[PDB]
């Protein structure tokens, strides 16, 4: 009884180019709890990424918020890579300032 | 008004890759205020809300007592993982998970509305304290082992003394000490954004940002006709600063944007909002 | 407070 994660990538504030924001990758609805999440800037792992403390929902499925400070620009691509036992290949989800 | 104190335990085995791990968090309503992680060198209970980090003058023994309790809990569920895996005769080479959620709902009079204590094994119901706070529901044959053990130790009585007593008293203490955080009802900041797809279609996206508590209703409506089956409604998500975000988007034909309204309900709002592009 | 347990209860 395993569950594949949902993934949202977004910023804490509406993306104002040149201003400091937070990049969030919210992973939810997964089971079991071990999961690998990396934030990417221009295709390479951001090093100083933090995450919330492991919690879960009514249906027992887990959720985590991974986050890092960032300053978005007009060209800097950002993304979140997620692997999990339920995933035969990792999922990558691009950041979109309108989502 | 109403509120809840809730504790969440996750314990899981890591065969080969180390000893079992135990992570516990506590919430008041939608705000996390404490954590404990057994993978620390000397694990202690740690504050995760501003009113904890700065108002333990009320009880200078809080952290000693809660570190001790979480340490004992960590040991219990580490043992529990072996007991439970044996009930199923599962191989020791697989990873397995026990979860527990317990706590209390209080009403506006400050009295218990309901207490609860529920456990899962590998993501499915395993055993739960019944609403009489006196007996247990076991979900399968293995869980009846745990129930008989728990009946013999008289553990429902202890569970329940905690739920009607310390749980209620601590919920009420946290609400007073954390009133600035917990009794806020921050309404969402709302706006619509507009994203052309082609010459003929455009996405309208209605945004709710920065709100607390998490509960909220966002709908799109087409001149009276509700659009719940047409829209994409994203799961509510944490902002990372103690509040939440949500949006609902709708594909409409170009030229028709003015006929659609977004409707936002949240308890921080004096009245529901209606947005129009 | 976290609830206190009683040795091993599972």
């Amino acid at each position: 009884i395993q569950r594949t994660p949902k993934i949202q990538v977004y910023s804490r504030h509406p993306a104002e180019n040149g201003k400091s924001n937070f990049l969030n990758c919210y992973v939810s609805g997964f089971h079991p709890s071990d999961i690998e999440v990396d934030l990417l800037k221009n295709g390479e792992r951001i090093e100083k990424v933090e995450h919330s403390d492991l919690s879960f929902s009514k249906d027992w499925s887990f959720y985590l918020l991974y986050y890092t400070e960032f300053t978005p620009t007009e060209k800097d691509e950002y993304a979140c890579r997620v692997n999990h036992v339920t995933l035969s290949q990792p999922k990558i989800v691009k950041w979109d300032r309108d989502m | 008004g109403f509120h809840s104190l809730r504790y969440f335990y996750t314990a899981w085995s890591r065969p080969g890759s180390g000893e079992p791990r135990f992570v516990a968090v506590g919430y008041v309503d939608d705000t996390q205020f404490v954590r404990f992680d057994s993978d620390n060198a000397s694990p202690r209970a740690e504050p995760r809300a501003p009113w904890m980090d700065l108002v333990e003058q009320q009880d200078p023994q809080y952290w000693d007592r809660n570190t001790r309790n979480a340490r004992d809990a960590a040991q219990t569920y580490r043992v529990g993982l072996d007991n439970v895996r044996g009930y199923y005769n599962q191989s020791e080479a697989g990873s397995h998970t026990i979860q527990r959620m317990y706590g209390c709902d209080v009403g506006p009079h400050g009295r218990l509305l309901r207490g609860y204590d529920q456990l899962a094994y590998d993501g499915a119901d395993y055993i739960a304290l019944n609403e009489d706070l006196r007996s247990w529901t076991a979900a399968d044959l293995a869980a009846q082992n745990t129930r008989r053990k728990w009946e013999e130790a008289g553990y429902a009585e202890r569970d329940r003394a905690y739920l009607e007593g310390e749980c209620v008293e601590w919920l009420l203490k946290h609400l007073e000490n954390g009133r600035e955080t917990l009794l806020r009802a921050d309404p969402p900041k709302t706006h619509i954004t507009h994203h052309p797809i082609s010459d003929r279609e455009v996405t309208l996206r209605c945004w709710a940002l920065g709100f607390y508590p998490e509960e909220i209703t966002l709908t799109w409506q087409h001149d009276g006709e509700d659009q719940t089956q047409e829209m994409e409604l994203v799961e509510t998500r944490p902002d990372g600063n103690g509040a939440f975000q949500k949006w609902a988007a709708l594909v409409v034909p170009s030229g028709e944007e003015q006929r659609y309204t977004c409707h936002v309900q949240h308890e921080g709002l004096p009245q529901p909002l209606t947005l129009r592009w | 407070d976290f609830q206190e347990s009683a040795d091993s209860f599972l």
Side-chain angles (χ1 to χ4, degrees), chain B residues 180-181 183-189 209-213 242-243 266-269:
Chain B
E180 224 50 35
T181 297
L183 295 187
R184 86 199 199 261
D186 287 347
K189 307 161 262 232
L209 298 176
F211 54 94
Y212 180 99
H266 188 273
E267 74 191 68
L269 284 168

Side-chain angles (χ1 to χ4, degrees), chain A residues 20-85:
Chain A
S20 58
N21 210 339
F22 281 85
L23 184 70
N24 291 334
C25 181
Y26 179 59
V27 291
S28 63
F30 58 95
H31 212 288
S33 62
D34 280 342
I35 194 170
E36 173 191 11
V37 185
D38 293 298
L39 306 196
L40 307 170
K41 165 164 180 176
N42 298 309
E44 295 147 323
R45 200 185 59 106
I46 297 159
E47 282 166 354
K48 288 341 200 306
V49 170
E50 298 216 288
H51 61 81
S52 65
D53 304 317
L54 185 65
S55 196
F56 52 87
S57 310
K58 70 306 140 126
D59 70 355
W60 303 107
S61 72
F62 296 102
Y63 57 89
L64 288 169
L65 178 64
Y66 288 67
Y67 59 96
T68 191
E69 283 209 316
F70 82 136
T71 316
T73 56
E74 213 148 300
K75 165 174 70 193
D76 273 306
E77 184 267 19
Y78 292 95
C80 176
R81 173 198 190 280
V82 173
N83 205 348
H84 188 254
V85 69

Side-chain angles (χ1 to χ4, degrees), chain B residues 37-56:
Chain B
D37 188 350
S38 72
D39 259 12
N40 304 151
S42 90
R44 310 262 323 166
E46 299 172 272
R48 301 286 281 167
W51 85 84
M52 302 290 291
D53 274 89
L54 296 295
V55 198
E56 289 334 278

Side-chain angles (χ1 to χ4, degrees), chain B residues 140-155:
Chain B
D140 62 32
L141 209 58
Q144 294 173 0
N145 291 295
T146 291
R147 164 159 56 59
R148 280 186 299 270
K149 193 166 315 174
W150 283 6
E151 279 162 0
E152 273 188 84
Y155 179 51

Side-chain angles (χ1 to χ4, degrees), chain A residues 6-21:
Chain A
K6 276 53 63 167
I7 301 163
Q8 291 194 65
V9 197
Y10 54 108
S11 58
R12 171 181 314 180
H13 302 282
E16 231 174 313
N17 281 336
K19 195 147 79 136
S20 58
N21 210 339

Side-chain angles (χ1 to χ4, degrees), chain B residues 65-66 76 87 100 102 146 150 155 162, chain C:
Chain B
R65 207 161 69 232
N66 276 275
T76 301
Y87 300 154
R100 184 187 181 201
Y102 65 92
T146 291
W150 283 6
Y155 179 51
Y162 167 87
Chain C
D1 298 347
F2 295 108
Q3 180 188 104
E4 36 209 51
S5 35
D7 275 49
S8 288
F9 265 15
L10 278 142

Side-chain angles (χ1 to χ4, degrees), chain B:
Chain B
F2 313 68
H3 307 273
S4 65
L5 202 215
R6 296 185 183 109
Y7 276 108
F8 303 75
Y9 294 177
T10 308
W12 71 103
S13 56
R14 302 179 293 190
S17 324
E19 289 308 301
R21 191 166 172 197
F22 174 88
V23 173
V25 298
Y27 285 77
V28 173
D29 297 338
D30 301 322
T31 304
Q32 193 206 333
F33 73 96
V34 64
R35 71 161 180 208
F36 175 95
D37 188 350
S38 72
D39 259 12
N40 304 151
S42 90
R44 310 262 323 166
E46 299 172 272
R48 301 286 281 167
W51 85 84
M52 302 290 291
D53 274 89
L54 296 295
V55 198
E56 289 334 278
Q57 322 153 296
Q58 318 307 56
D59 181 342
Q61 304 80 260
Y62 189 89
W63 295 119
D64 296 329
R65 207 161 69 232
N66 276 275
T67 290
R68 184 175 308 115
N69 282 342
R71 279 180 177 166
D72 299 335
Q75 239 294 327
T76 301
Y77 292 94
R78 254 78 79 88
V79 175
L81 277 170
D82 270 312
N83 295 1
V84 180
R85 176 211 60 88
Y87 300 154
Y88 295 105
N89 188 56
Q90 291 169 325
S91 150
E92 294 184 22
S95 186
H96 293 282
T97 307
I98 296 171
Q99 290 157 272
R100 184 187 181 201
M101 188 280 302
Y102 65 92
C104 49
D105 295 350
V106 85
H109 36 59
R111 294 195 294 273
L112 183 67
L113 282 184
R114 66 199 142 289
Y116 33 86
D117 180 14
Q118 300 156 247
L119 279 85
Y121 185 64
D122 285 333
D125 286 345
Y126 179 74
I127 197 173
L129 191 70
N130 295 320
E131 200 104 339
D132 60 3
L133 310 191
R134 163 173 259 127
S135 54
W136 311 88
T137 299
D140 62 32
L141 209 58
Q144 294 173 0
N145 291 295
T146 291
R147 164 159 56 59
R148 280 186 299 270
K149 193 166 315 174
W150 283 6
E151 279 162 0
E152 273 188 84
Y155 179 51
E157 266 289 326
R158 297 172 128 278
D159 226 8
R160 173 256 212 76
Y162 167 87
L163 295 167
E164 306 176 324
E166 280 118 332
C167 192
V168 170
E169 297 159 25
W170 273 106
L171 183 272
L172 296 167
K173 276 154 166 178
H174 287 318
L175 282 175
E176 171 58 26
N177 296 348
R179 81 189 81 74
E180 224 50 35
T181 297
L182 303 166
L183 295 187
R184 86 199 199 261
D186 287 347
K189 307 161 262 232
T190 57
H191 67 293
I192 293 173
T193 61
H194 173 268
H195 321 285
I197 298 183
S198 68
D199 279 328
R200 326 281 324 105
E201 292 189 309
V202 63
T203 295
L204 293 172
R205 179 162 284 112
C206 186
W207 293 84
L209 298 176
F211 54 94
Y212 180 99
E214 182 185 42
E215 169 64 28
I216 198 181
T217 309
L218 292 185
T219 51
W220 280 104
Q221 258 181 48
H222 187 64
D223 321 322
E225 249 2 60
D226 196 325
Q227 311 291 302
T228 43
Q229 254 325 277
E230 169 163 16
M231 74 183 182
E232 160 164 35
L233 184 67
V234 86
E235 184 209 333
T236 305
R237 63 211 197 176
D239 67 349
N241 193 40
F244 301 90
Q245 309 186 340
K246 205 189 184 54
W247 55 256
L250 207 76
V251 161
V252 313
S254 196
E256 299 318 307
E257 293 94 317
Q258 312 186 32
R259 303 173 71 81
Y260 299 80
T261 46
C262 170
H263 305 266
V264 181
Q265 180 61 291
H266 188 273
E267 74 191 68
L269 284 168
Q271 288 107 11
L273 291 163
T274 300
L275 299 96
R276 182 185 312 275
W277 175 236

